[PDB]
Design a protein around this ligand. Sequence first.
Ligand code: B6R
Ligand code: FMN
Ligand code: LDA
Ligand code: ORO
Length: 363
Amino acid sequence: GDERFYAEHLMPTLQGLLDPESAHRLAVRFTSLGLLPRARFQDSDMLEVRVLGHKFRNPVGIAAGFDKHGEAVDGLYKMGFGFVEIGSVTPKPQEGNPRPRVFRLPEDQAVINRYGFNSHGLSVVEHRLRARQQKQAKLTEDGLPLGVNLGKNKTSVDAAEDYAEGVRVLGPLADYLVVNVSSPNTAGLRSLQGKAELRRLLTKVLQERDGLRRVHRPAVLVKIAPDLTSQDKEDIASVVKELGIDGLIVTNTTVSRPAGLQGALRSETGGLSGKPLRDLSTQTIREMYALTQGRVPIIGVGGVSSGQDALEKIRAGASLVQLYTALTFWGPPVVGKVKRELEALLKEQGFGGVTDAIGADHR
Ligand SMILES: COc1cccc(-c2c(F)cc(-n3nnc4c3C(=O)c3ccccc3C4=O)cc2F)c1
Ligand SMILES: Cc1cc2nc3c(=O)[nH]c(=O)nc-3n(C[C@H](O)[C@H](O)[C@H](O)COP(=O)(O)O)c2cc1C
Ligand SMILES: CCCCCCCCCCCC[N+](C)(C)[O-]
Ligand SMILES: O=C(O)c1cc(=O)[nH]c(=O)[nH]1
């Protein structure tokens, strides 16, 4: 009912009226005010996952970049997400790139963006999360954890110190932190994925994390690009296991342009998301799971808009999944859709629950 209405009428009309950045801002505003069809899908026990030191009521989260500044967290749980990731947040406020900087590719169910880490900054987000800190503690206890994605300022001279500052300021307010060294829209950022400097970077991040008081000590994950060489992936897997990184987020957007894109805006600079990313991301999950011997939890992200998409990433090795771009084309009803379809498929394929399906393709 709602699914078809949003997919066929409301969302196409919103897109026809509003440029994508304006549409996004509106979406954040409506969500933050709770103006949603409060999801009627009740999460079953077979969607529950225990990972990263926490219970997740369902495995479907909102990816970083939708709520960059932590303004819509409670609205996103109301939408039915099992967990919420905010950010990326940079140490100091910054405006990001000039407009236009986000583009729809409707023929491809894809988006291209070059926001460039527009961020209200750590201090503003810190106070925003503090204002609801105990509400979040209850939510987390009830299986609805919060992640915080950390970025670095454009003019930063020391990337590791930017991330360290983020750990110190928002680590105490997060169930998990993400070190995003994979945005395609900040010069030299991705080069932080190389081995020598990744080890240095992550050693410092983990030191800072370990310095937090026990009840305020988050898991630390690394978010990687889909555009890594085999060498890059081997090196990341090695460092992650060496240092005891708690997990991986796989993947960010791609700077590649797969053959077959039809959208008029396909040659815009930026990271590509949505369906053309889907299988590239799933294969990166598959590879990283194997390289880490299934011992490092993976959050799978890229082009998920159905239960099949979710289950493919779970069977490839993901313990949890996220989506973003599907919201742009399907609206809020897509969250319940993915969860309902995922539950149905798990039953069909003989899994007792999500946990039994994690990494199943490798076995
Ligand atoms: C009353 O019903 C509700 C309730 C809550 C939210 C919404 C809603 C929504 F979920 C997505 C959009 N939306 N349409 N096009 C786009 C978006 C983005 O969010 C977006 C984000 C980032 C890049 C690009 C885009 C983009 O191109 C518009 C909405 F109003 C509708
Ligand atoms: C408009 C937009 C902004 C994004 N901003 C961030 C960000 O700030 N930090 C981050 O780690 N990922 C960011 N992402 C990447 C998403 O978190 C996700 O990894 C990617 O879009 C693939 O998922 P999807 O195909 O479901 O959208 C952004 C994606 C989009 C489309
Ligand atoms: C194998 C790499 C190819 C690039 C990505 C492939 C996209 C698969 C097409 C399914 C998407 C359907 N749609 C509506 C979004 O166009
Ligand atoms: O802010 C952005 O441009 C951005 C950051 C990121 O990590 N990924 C992405 O696609 N865009």
